[PDB]
């Protein structure tokens, strides 16, 4: 129990932090990855002067603060502001004292060696956690779907990745990163919806375009004869009621937004798209392992939640793969937390105890120890 209860799992994202206790089924804490700094001197009624704001209080009060994102494209870019988000996570969100809890953290696919050593330096030397561990994100997603070999298409708020994993070892030279994700996708909907003849003028109009994207957006299979369908004008249309009455209608654009993930050309991106990239990762891997990867395309991440994403991907890679092959696109329902759940499982596991980096290992080996 000492640490059975006690292991923490913190998944640091570009848009959201997911956090909680190893053992739980889902994150106890989910909140924006921002750190707000007040543009002016003054106070809220009853509070003192605050130097900084994190998560939702930074989002809610955004009009008087300069908002900053510590993690650009999955990589920690500002370490002063990240230690601020961690502090908030332990002390306010989970309300635990960190110096008696083992902490499993996550990093990104080709996270620079030096960063994995730096967050270890900050975990052990400024938070004084007993022990910690850094798992790679795609690797926890795979594992949370039971398996050990497969290829994960991972897509969240600032990055998309393909991480081919074989008997647990993520394959460095076959990993692909596509910098277009849910953030890019909300801003494109924004324009095709103002372009539908609308105005997201006040900040209460801006924010909810993102809630339109999440609730009403679709990834149609045969996106071709779906536009064609749009035109005959079926009961395909969908009206959403705004903060007030102002019933906005979205028929068609509803799927023009996730067609951006297959066609980056919709947004002036010259890069290849999700399905081709799944494939290219795969023809960059060893030959003998390619049947395995093909029957185990595990999807994880908030942006892979658009319904019919899996069917489109299913047919997208069948028709690029040699017919002798078995294609299989696994997309679980909890996928917006796969990464986290994979960490919860792993860290609560009976056999993981012997991989925890302890302060004994650290004080004796330097940050190098956990770096592997």
């Amino acid at each position: 129990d000492e640490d059975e209860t006690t292991a923490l799992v913190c998944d640091n994202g570009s848009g959201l932090v997911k956090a909680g206790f190893a053992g739980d089924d889902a994150p106890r804490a989910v909140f924006p990855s921002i750190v707000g700094r007040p543009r002016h001197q003054g106070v809220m009624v009853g509070m003192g002067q605050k130097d900084s704001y994190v998560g939702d209080e930074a989002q809610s009060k955004r009009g008087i603060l300069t908002l900053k994102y510590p993690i650009e494209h999955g990589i920690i870019t500002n370490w002063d502001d990240m230690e601020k988000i961690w502090h908030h996570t332990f002390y306010n969100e989970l309300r635990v004292a960190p110096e008696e809890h083992p902490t499993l953290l996550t990093e990104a696919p080709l996270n620079p060696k030096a960063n994995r050593e730096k967050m270890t330096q900050i975990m052990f030397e400024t938070f004084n956690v007993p022990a910690m561990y850094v798992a790679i994100q795609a690797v926890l997603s795979l594992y949370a779907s039971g398996r050990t070999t497969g290829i994960v298409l991972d897509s969240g708020d600032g990055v998309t990745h393909n991480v081919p994993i074989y008997e647990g070892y993520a394959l460095p030279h076959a990993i692909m990163r596509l910098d277009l994700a849910g953030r890019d996708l909300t801003d494109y909907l924004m324009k095709i919806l103002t372009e539908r003849g609308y105005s997201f003028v006040t900040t209460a109009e801006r924010e909810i375009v993102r809630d339109i994207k999440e609730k009403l957006c679709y990834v149609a299979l045969d996106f071709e004869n779906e536009m064609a369908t749009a035109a005959s004008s079926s009961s395909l249309e969908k009206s959403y009621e705004l903060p007030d009455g102002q019933v906005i209608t979205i028929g068609n654009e509803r799927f023009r937004c996730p067609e951006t993930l297959f066609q980056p050309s919709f947004i002036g991106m010259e890069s290849a798209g999700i399905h081709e990239t799944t494939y290219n990762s795969i023809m960059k891997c060893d030959i003998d392992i390619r049947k395995d990867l093909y029957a185990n395309n595990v999807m994880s991440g908030g942006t892979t939640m658009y319904p019919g994403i899996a069917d489109r991907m299913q047919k997208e890679i069948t028709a690029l793969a040699p017919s002798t092959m078995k294609i299989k696109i696994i997309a679980p329902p909890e996928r917006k937390y796969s990464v986290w759940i994979g960490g919860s499982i792993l860290a609560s596991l009976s056999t993981f105890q012997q991989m925890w980096i302890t302060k004994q290992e650290y004080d004796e080996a330097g940050p190098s120890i956990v770096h592997r």
Binding site: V43, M44, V45, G46, M47, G48, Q49, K50, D51, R95, A97
Partner: protein, 643 residues
């Protein structure tokens, strides 16, 4: 720790620790308060006699006439330390050793109403019935603080007195912990020694009929409610109260019981409160010189004044029950305040006054896993009192090194505490932020909280964010007092500090047939002019703006009175939670010592030249060393001697 302990196991309760006069609860009887002792300690420096309270108390007197300065005695300790006892005992002392009403001295209804020396005395037993109760620690715990000014004459004979009350435990009136009980009065009255009373008030003799007063315990073996009732009764009289008033008091004390019996129910299909009967209201109404109806309306359909008019507002069941309770408490309090005033009034003589001796009885810094508003107020009081000492000592010390000719330079010892005090009492400090937000019609405890931080956090050292775990219950803010770190919970503060009262009702009181009741409310009725419309400032018409706005004013008027005084200190101690004579838990006494000031006086002493002997205390004990030449020195000049 060890010295105290040893002389206790030997049954010596009075040991000095510098200027202090430590006192340990015997938990049994002693010939110390002995009428022989009283004399013995009469005219003796504390070096001519062993450690005892009369030493302090006499010296004060002495000093009083010798230096022509006013004096003070500061008694302080935890709930079970037994201060009242001392306080009282000190008081008798004064009365005895310097009375002489000449005519009042005869054995003809001696000490009955009609003399002060008695009034002076009789005072206590009234206040005690109303401001005292069975605590889980004491059986007669003081649920309020107090300050008496014994105004001595020119000659040196008694002339006047002056009481002042601070921080009364309003909550007892409505609540009570499981092993405790409410004020005595209630139990006194229902005791049945004066059966008329029962019928007069319209109550029963079984307390379980009055929820407000039987939530905890009803009877205490060591107390004879029947005897007290008279004590109380008789005291009132002596105190010069009018029968009527003496009738108001009673009648008023029963109304309050009744209130807690007032019941309500939800109007059908409505979320409104509607009276669940006019059985009790009737009694409460009559007893207060009110009208049942008018009363139940005001209560249910509070008619407010938002904007420039008076808007009738509807309340919920939960809202009523709570408002009632608010008046119950409000009324009791006020009354209590009044009684004090009235007492003071009798204690007013025309004879000239040249000096006084103030006897202050209040609580000491207590730390609980749970510290709320009330704790801050008290702690703040103490942290002030402490600085008050640290200074007196600095002043004092420095005289010696000046008298002797030593060359020692040092900074005021008070200074160390100024940090904490400013943070509380200064303008952008806690109280202010507390009392401002109270002006915001839509503020939250949470609101208040943030304001507290944004402004003090990171910028102030004594200011800190809590340590939520250990024996503590939640988080909000810790302070760094001299005694240590106190973890404060801010929840209810805003309210508690606003003293919200249904003004419609108060209206009724204001026009009662029961003058006294009418009186008690006057000062509320005279400030309404000032807070006529919604929002704004109550003070415009003389209404309190803060729960804390006075406390401060009173605490200032006090600490000022304390200054034009020659401070005399007394620290009361509590041996063991278990109530056993000749015993002591260590850490329990240790605690007190830190929060007492005792350990801080030792510190300041040790900076340096630890042990410091008072001259007579020096003569006596050591004359024998060069017997001839040391005795001559000590006798020939109390000081020059030791030299």
């Amino acid at each position: 720790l060890y010295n105290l302990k040893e002389r206790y196991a030997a049954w010596m309760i009075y040991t000095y620790s510098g200027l202090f006069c430590v006192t340990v609860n015997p938990y049994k009887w002693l010939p110390v308060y002995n009428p022989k002792v009283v004399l013995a300690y009469r005219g003796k420096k504390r070096q001519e006699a062993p450690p005892h309270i009369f030493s302090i108390s006499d010296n004060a007197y002495q000093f009083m006439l010798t230096d022509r300065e006013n004096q003070s005695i500061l008694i302080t300790g935890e709930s079970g330390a037994g201060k009242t006892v001392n306080t009282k005992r000190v008081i008798q002392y004064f009365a005895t050793i310097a009375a002489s009403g000449e005519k009042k001295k005869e054995e003809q209804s001696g000490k009955m109403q009609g003399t002060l020396e008695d009034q002076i005395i009789s005072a206590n037993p009234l206040l005690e019935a109303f401001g005292n109760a069975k605590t889980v620690r004491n059986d007669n715990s003081s649920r309020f603080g107090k300050f008496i000014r014994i105004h001595f004459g020119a000659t040196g004979k008694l002339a006047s007195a002056d009481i002042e009350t601070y921080l009364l435990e309003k909550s007892r009136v409505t609540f009570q912990l499981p092993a405790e009980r409410s004020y005595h009065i209630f139990y006194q009255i229902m005791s049945n020694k004066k059966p008329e009373l029962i019928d007069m008030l319209l109550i029963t003799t079984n307390p379980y009929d009055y929820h407000y007063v039987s939530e905890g315990e009803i009877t205490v073996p060591s107390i004879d409610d029947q005897e007290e009732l008279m004590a109380t009764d008789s005291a009132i009289d002596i105190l010069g109260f009018s029968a009527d008033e003496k009738t108001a008091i009673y009648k008023l004390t029963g109304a309050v019981m009744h209130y807690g019996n007032l019941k309500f129910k939800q109007k059908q299909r409505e979320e409104q409160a509607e009276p669940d009967g006019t059985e009790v209201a009737d009694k409460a109404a009559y007893l207060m010189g009110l009208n049942s109806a008018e009363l139940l309306k005001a209560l249910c359909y509070p008619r407010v004044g938002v904007g420039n008019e008076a808007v009738t507002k509807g309340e919920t069941v939960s809202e009523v029950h709570n408002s009632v309770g608010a008046l119950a408490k409000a009324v009791y309090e006020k009354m209590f305040l009044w009684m004090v005033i009235r007492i003071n009034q009798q204690l007013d003589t025309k004879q000239p006054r040249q000096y006084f001796i103030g006897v202050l009885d209040i609580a000491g810094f207590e730390i609980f896993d749970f510290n709320s508003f009330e704790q801050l107020c008290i702690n703040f009081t103490n942290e002030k009192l402490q600085q008050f000492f640290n200074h007196h000592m600095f002043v004092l010390e420095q005289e010696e090194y000046k008298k002797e000719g030593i060359e020692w330079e040092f900074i005021d010892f008070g200074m160390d505490l100024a940090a904490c005090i400013e943070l509380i009492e200064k303008p952008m400090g806690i109280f202010s932020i507390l009392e401002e937000e109270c002006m915001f019609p839509k503020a939250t405890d949470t609101s208040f909280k943030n304001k507290l931080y944004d402004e003090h956090l990171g910028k102030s050292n004594n200011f800190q964010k809590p340590k939520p775990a250990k024996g503590k219950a939640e988080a909000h803010f810790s302070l760094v007092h001299y005694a240590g770190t106190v973890d404060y919970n801010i929840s209810g503060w805003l309210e508690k500090n606003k003293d919200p009262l249904n003004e419609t009702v108060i209206g009724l009181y204001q026009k009662s047939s029961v003058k006294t009741l009418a009186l008690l409310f006057a000062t509320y009725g005279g400030e309404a002019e000032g807070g006529g419309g919604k929002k704004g400032g109550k003070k415009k018409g003389s209404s309190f703006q803060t729960v804390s706005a006075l406390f401060r004013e009173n605490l200032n008027k006090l600490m000022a009175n304390l200054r034009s005084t020659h401070p005399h200190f007394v620290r009361c101690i509590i041996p063991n939670e278990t109530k056993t004579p000749g015993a002591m838990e260590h850490e329990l006494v240790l605690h007190q010592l830190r929060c007492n000031g005792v350990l801080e006086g030792i510190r300041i002493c040790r900076k340096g030249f630890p042990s410091r002997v008072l001259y007579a205390d020096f003569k006596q004990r050591y004359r024998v060393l060069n017997a001839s030449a040391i005795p001559e020195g000590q006798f020939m000049d109390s000081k020059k001697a030791s030299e």
